[PDB]
Design a protein around this ligand. Structure first.
Ligand SMILES: Nc1ncnc2c1ncn2[C@@H]1O[C@H](COP(=O)(O)OP(=O)(O)O)[C@@H](O)[C@H]1O
Ligand SMILES: Nc1ncnc2c1ncn2[C@@H]1O[C@H](COP(=O)(O)OP(=O)(O)O)[C@@H](O)[C@H]1O
Ligand code: MET
Ligand code: MET
Lengths: 344, 216, 216, 343
């Protein structure tokens, strides 16, 4: 009951036409947990995350952060509200004129904070983010990673209860994203900071998120624990993103040769999803012996998401139509979700 | 060069410096608020009025559209009304600041447009009041733009106080007008001109040396 | 509102229009080549002369620096030699031309710096002569900037022409000086001024409307 | 077509001696697509320019179509550049010109009949599927559609060489596929030599016959794409062959991974496949024959220059007699078995 966005809808009257950004979006982020909202470019990730802070006004709905209604509020009270919700962004939005020290200090000077308390507060957050070294530097000097730590430190300046991330590592590279995401996680785990997160990369969700919602055109299609979404994904669109966190490519020549209608001399290529219980079990070797079947494994990968192992396989199965149907049955029996992609 | 001539140009150079810097100063005490309150009313901003903007923009465009010598000559009645005089140094510090303000506002608003908008968005996220973001974030980020606008401002105001010297503002504009147009003396005309180019190059050098002093 | 007054005043409008456009025209005949001469001669660029570029740019600088009044009057001895007259619009479009030429060449250079280097590299790879380059690729690409630059010159020459009233070039700007500076009539001052603001907007819109249609 | 010989180039910027390229010599057979790959700052940008002499080599000699281009004059160097068409990362199109006229430009530079420039340009546009979009200006066009204009222009002169400078560096994988695919159909149809530089590897596999690998000034390999992908000579190439095969090795195993055998252990292996092998159901086959259990971790197969390729990591549960017999069998079948550690 940390943050509760209920029925959030935002619409635009930008030109001669009215475009709909979000539809009855409802999400609840438990206190001390990390919630990621994932979606394609244009789904309303940006608008949604902005409704929490009320940089954007939801046409209709309810924004309840830390228990307090935010939608209807006095402008002098929204400022009192933002001292609990810091924000970080894709592009870093750091002031080019001020040192990393002053940059972290900036939200504090917005309240009439004493100069003596400020310096103590700033150094700790600079020591926390790993920039305690670079006290006297300007954003033009810092690398992408450095700059993002500053922005996080700055958001953590007001010692906020909730942290929002607007594609925060969408600009940083793979090597750096992980350390920022790990730093961002540690702050949550070590300090209990509630984090809301939007991204378009599923790699991001699985690395640090505890719950996850998949959004497509303003509507939420799958909404559940990270573990349940990475194992037993109920949406085809949801599968697309998961199958991307692991790099599972079907070689160009297969999808061309592969056809959904069964033909003479054909064998089924099927993709298998393993949930935690079956991921480490050598079931494809067992399946080879028991039912006298030959599996041509095209590609396969396993990973962890939400503290739960999972994995996916792409394979064509050779054998008798009776044998094939039998081993598939043994896989479904052993918590491996079998799904036939067609025949080749 | 006469001995009275030397102690005369010195007063000219003084009257010229006094006019450009004071007019520049007043043009900013006025233009800077006009420019900031022009930027904050643009569609999508903190206080976007498509109606208020069109007006404040329409007047600056009109004033800015009026050639200075004409603006000055037409302002002669107001000048005498407010100064009590039409002739002189402090008489000219009036049409020169009114001439300067329309230019300053456009530049200030344009300088503020260099600031990447997410910086504004970031400010609000922290809980910044609309007045705070101006003095805390906007002016500081556009400071090199503004310091640069001021240089370019003072310089147009050198050319401006000069035109004033043909209609009685004094300064080096007067000395070049009397002794270069009406009655001609070679040493007198040339030293006026060379004093004016040096004054511009000094005003440019000083402005740049201050822009180069801001951290990238 | 004397009809006869109106008939000259109508002359004045013609005197300014003539001065603005004819000086503008010659400003570009001097400006376009000095402008590309700098850009092309830039250090990154193909001609790559610092020694020649330094010289040309510094000439452009010391002229841009000279305020127009002090230039116009200083040029009189020279103005007279070329035309035989120091008075009248036809002598005046001479210092009006040298007023705008250096102002233009820097606009032209900057208008060419806007277009992506690599149109040169795409261009060179096809066997393009530097003469072919400038004419076939450089200039056409810079056209929105060239048209916008001419608008700026013309608006500037409007304001530059009226300053000629004081040295007696004689134009709509002069009607202002005589009636406003010496013998104040409120109908002719209001009427001269309003006519020039209208002339700036016509110059802006003619220019702005043509640029809108020259981007692609 | 292209024979760069012992070419060396050093820049003169700021009292710094950048070995842009060091003793580089490259030979390309007429009508064959040849690629050059390297890390940023390696010298491929400088190099591809050395071909048509947009950059002058401080040492060495360049001959295209047999004729040397360094020993030339400015007007003779233009006439020679009519045979070396070039395309660019940033698509470099005149925004003032239309698609048609943009392609007509290279033909305009060298005076040509109006009807002939219509005829010529009309061919090349309908060839790239832009005989339709004649009237559009580049501001309007797509990333790929602009590159199709760039291509159509490079061939306006009907050249013998088509140089590509990171042509798809800033392009969509679907329209990267299509562009590379378009360039390939051109190689075959016209006998056009393609020499391309890139930092992307996906492109090397996709369209190259041969490939060089350049670094720190000097190109250190030069084999078939196929041969280089399977059996890389330089440690540099190993890195490039690593980016293509998406081989995510689990993080969890490292704390669990041992350098030497432990009681109740199963070894962990890295299997590398080649050609027809990649499609053989080999792990289902060893599973029966030697009664061992492969818990399969990771697998990716990839065509890399006309030869199929594959790699996988597995545990192998079973007896020590069953294991050495299956591992031996796999090796007898040309699967490269490398043991990594134990779990
Ligand atoms: N400032 C804005 N002005 C006009 N339309 C907008 C604005 N922001 C978003 N939209 C529209 O609303 C939709 C919401 O998506 P957006 O907020 O951009 O999130 P995402 O990161 O998923 O694209 C966008 O596809 C866009 O069409
Ligand atoms: N015109 C130039 N002047 C000075 N240095 C250059 C120039 N062009 C490239 N360089 C530098 O020298 C090296 C040449 O490699 P380059 O030709 O850019 O290949 P790549 O495409 O692999 O970067 C690079 O490190 C680059 O930064
Ligand atoms: C790209 S790994 C190739 C392995 C083969 N498909 C098998 O079934 O064992
Ligand atoms: C998520 S891939 C799981 C494959 C399984 N462990 C097998 O080898 O049979």
């Amino acid at each position: 009951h940390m943050i509760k966005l209920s029925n959030i809808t935002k619409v635009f009257h930008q030109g001669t036409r009215t475009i709909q950004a979000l539809n009855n979006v409802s999400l609840h982020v438990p206190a001390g947990q990390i919630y990621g909202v994932i979606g394609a470019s244009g789904a309303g990730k940006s608008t949604l995350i902005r409704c929490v802070n009320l940089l954007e006004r939801p046409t209709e709905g309810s924004v309840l952060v830390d228990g307090q209604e935010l939608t209807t509020l006095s402008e002098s009270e929204l400022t009192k509200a933002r001292r609990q919700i810091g924000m970080i962004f894709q592009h870093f939005n750091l002031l080019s004129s001020r040192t990393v020290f002053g940059n972290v200090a900036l939200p504090l000077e917005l309240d009439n904070t004493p100069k003596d308390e400020v310096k103590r507060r700033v150094t700790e957050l600079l020591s926390l983010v790993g920039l305690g070294d670079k006290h006297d530097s300007y954003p033009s000097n810092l690398s992408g990673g450095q700059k993002q730590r500053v922005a996080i430190a700055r958001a953590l300046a007001s010692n906020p209860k909730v942290l929002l991330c607007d594609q925060a590592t969408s600009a940083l590279d793979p090597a750096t994203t992980r350390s920022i995401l790990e730093l961002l996680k540690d702050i949550n785990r070590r300090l209990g900071l509630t984090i809301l997160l939007i991204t378009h990369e599923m790699d991001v969700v699985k690395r640090i998120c505890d719950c996850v919602a998949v959004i497509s055109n303003g509507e939420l299609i799958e909404q559940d624990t990270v573990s349940e979404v990475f194992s037993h994904p109920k949406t085809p669109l949801a599968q697309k993103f998961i199958q991307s966190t692991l790099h599972l490519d079907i070689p160009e020549d297969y999808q061309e040769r592969l056809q959904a209608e069964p033909f003479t001399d054909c064998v089924p290529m099927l993709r298998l999803e393993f949930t935690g219980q079956s991921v480490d079990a050598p079931l494809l070797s067992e399946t080879a012996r028991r039912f006298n079947v030959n599996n041509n494994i095209i590609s396969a990968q396993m990973d962890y998401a939400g503290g739960v192992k999972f994995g996916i396989m792409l394979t064509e199965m050779h054998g008798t139509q009776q044998d094939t149907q039998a081993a598939i049955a043994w896989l479904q029996e052993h918590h491996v979700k079998v799904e036939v992609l067609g025949y080749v | 060069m006469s001995e009275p001539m030397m102690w005369l140009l010195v007063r000219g150079v003084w009257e010229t410096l006094a006019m450009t810097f004071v007019s520049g100063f007043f043009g900013f005490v006025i233009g800077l608020p006009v420019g900031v309150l022009l930027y904050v009313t643009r569609p999508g901003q903190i206080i976007a009025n498509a109606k208020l903007y069109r007006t404040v923009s329409a007047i600056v465009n009109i004033f800015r559209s009026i050639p200075f010598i004409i603006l000055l000559v037409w302002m002669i009645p107001f000048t005498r009304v407010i100064v009590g005089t039409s002739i002189g140094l402090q008489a000219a510090i009036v049409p020169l600041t009114v001439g300067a303000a329309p230019f300053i506002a456009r530049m200030v608003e344009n300088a503020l447009l260099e600031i990447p908008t997410g910086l504004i968005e970031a400010s609000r996220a922290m809980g910044a009041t609309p007045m705070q973001i101006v003095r805390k974030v906007l002016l500081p980020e556009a400071l090199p733009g503004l310091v640069n606008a001021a240089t370019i401002t003072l310089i147009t105001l050198v050319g401006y106080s000069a035109m004033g010297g043909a209609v009685g503002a004094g300064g080096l504009g007067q000395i070049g007008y009397q002794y270069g147009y009406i009655g001609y003396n070679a040493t007198v005309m040339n030293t006026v001109l060379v004093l004016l180019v040096i004054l511009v190059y000094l005003i440019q050098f000083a402005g740049d040396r201050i822009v180069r002093a801001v951290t990238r």
